[PDB]
Design an enzyme around this catalytic site. Structure first.
Site, PDB file in Angstrom:
ATOM      1  N   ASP A  35       0.827  -1.205   0.000  1.00  0.00           N
ATOM      2  CA  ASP A  35       0.000   0.000   0.000  1.00  0.00           C
ATOM      3  C   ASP A  35       0.861   1.254   0.000  1.00  0.00           C
ATOM      4  OD1 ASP A  35      -1.909   1.975   0.347  1.00  0.00           O
ATOM      5  OD2 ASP A  35      -2.498   1.323   2.363  1.00  0.00           O
ATOM      6  N   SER A 199      -0.821  15.656 -11.959  1.00  0.00           N
ATOM      7  CA  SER A 199      -1.095  15.276 -13.332  1.00  0.00           C
ATOM      8  C   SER A 199      -1.333  16.525 -14.169  1.00  0.00           C
ATOM      9  CB  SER A 199      -2.314  14.353 -13.408  1.00  0.00           C
ATOM     10  OG  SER A 199      -2.668  14.091 -14.755  1.00  0.00           O
TER      11      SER A 199
END
Ligand SMILES: CC[C@](C)(CN)N1CCOCC1
Ligand SMILES: CC[C@](C)(CN)N1CCOCC1
Length: 330
Positions: A35, A199
């Protein structure tokens, strides 16, 4: 040193991925959920409340000659889906795909919530976010990656998650045969303890690319892709019959639909998520309403590039002095 381990989807929807991990002496092999959105290595154990264990493999520290109780240390985590767990802490030898760390903090669960108990295939979590998020008290502990880092050939690990297929976690090296084209690296903020990046935009299907900054985290421990409401609305608007359902808790769409791809920007580069990756199947067994793999982050407070996004790429988690993230197509 290096390590390389195969990671396998737990079910037919790629809800999560498990990776075998050797703990203790003699080795006890547990299948852990790697994770990159948390920083605790915690396991079902001999100390876990009996009624809260349902098919998991447990870690038994008393059977490990290298296990040592970390005196006074406790841990407690509450993830962003209501799930939780807590317990005590041992240090022990932990190996992943041939890479060994001695003195790794192994957090033994005394209690786990029903949501973990129900996942019979996941024996615990191995956190790969920054150690600043580790919940051990009163002395915060380091992640497996943090502990391994100095010994690694290169201070990196990579995630190569498969779509409905096995994939790979590598530590200490880049497998240049595992991706196409080049790896585009992008800046990371560690201020929230996550692999947090920005992004450069998105496209829906064959549509034009929209240049827009989207801050978010690279999180192998989250199944879906959580993005701003505007972006998610633009995506599902291209799917006949798709709608946001308050009762189901997200966007749903007719199972008969063929979904468009979703492209996200990494610098000047582009990662394409095929439409099929965004189909998470019937909302309930036998239903013709399917759950969407792209969902709004509006109720979360952060955008999350979870497995839906990451499995479309070869992802480099670069733990150099100034960490960065790399993305390649594959
Ligand atoms: C954390 C519990 C949760 C969300 C639900 N039992 N699981 C589902 C299966 O994939 C891993 C995560
Ligand atoms: C990650 C999606 C999840 C939780 C997978 N078990 N479900 C949500 C409900 O509709 C079907 C898909």
């Amino acid at each position: 040193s290096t390590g390389s381990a195969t990671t396998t989807p737990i079910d037919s929807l790629d809800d999560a991925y498990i990776t075998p991990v050797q703990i203790g002496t003699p080795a006890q092999t547990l299948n852990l959920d790697f994770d990159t959105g948390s920083s605790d290595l915690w396991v079902f154990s001999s100390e876990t409340t009996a009624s809260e264990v349902d098919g998991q493999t447990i870690y038994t520290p008393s059977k490990s000659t290298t296990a040592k109780l970390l005196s006074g240390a406790t841990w407690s985590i509450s993830y962003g889906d209501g799930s939780s767990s807590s317990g005590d802490v041992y240090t022990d030898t932990v190996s992943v795909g041939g890479l060994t760390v001695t003195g790794q903090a192994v957090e033994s669960a005394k209690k786990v919530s029903s949501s973990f108990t129900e996942d019979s295939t996941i024996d615990g979590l191995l956190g790969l976010a920054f150690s600043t998020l580790n919940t051990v008290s009163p002395t915060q502990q380091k992640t497996f990656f943090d502990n391994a880092k100095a010994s690694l050939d290169s201070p990196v690990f990579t995630a190569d998650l498969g779509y409905h297929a096995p994939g790979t976690y590598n530590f200490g090296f880049i497998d240049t045969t595992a991706y196409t084209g080049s790896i585009t690296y992008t800046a990371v903020s560690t201020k929230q303890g996550f692999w947090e990046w920005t992004s450069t935009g998105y496209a829906v299907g064959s549509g034009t690319f929209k240049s827009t900054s989207i801050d978010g985290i690279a999180d192998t421990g989250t199944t879906l892709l959580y993005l701003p409401a505007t972006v998610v609305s633009a995506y599902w608007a291209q799917v006949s019959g798709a709608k946001s359902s308050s009762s189901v808790g997200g966007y749903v769409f007719p199972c008969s639909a063929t979904l468009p791809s979703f492209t996200f920007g990494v610098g000047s580069a582009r990662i394409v998520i095929p439409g099929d990756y965004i189909d998470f199947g019937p909302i309930s067994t036998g239903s013709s309403s399917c759950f969407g793999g792209i969902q709004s982050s509006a109720g979360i407070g952060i955008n999350i590039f979870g497995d839906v996004a990451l499995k479309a790429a070869f992802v480099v988690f670069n733990g150099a002095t100034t960490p960065t993230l790399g993305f390649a197509s594959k």
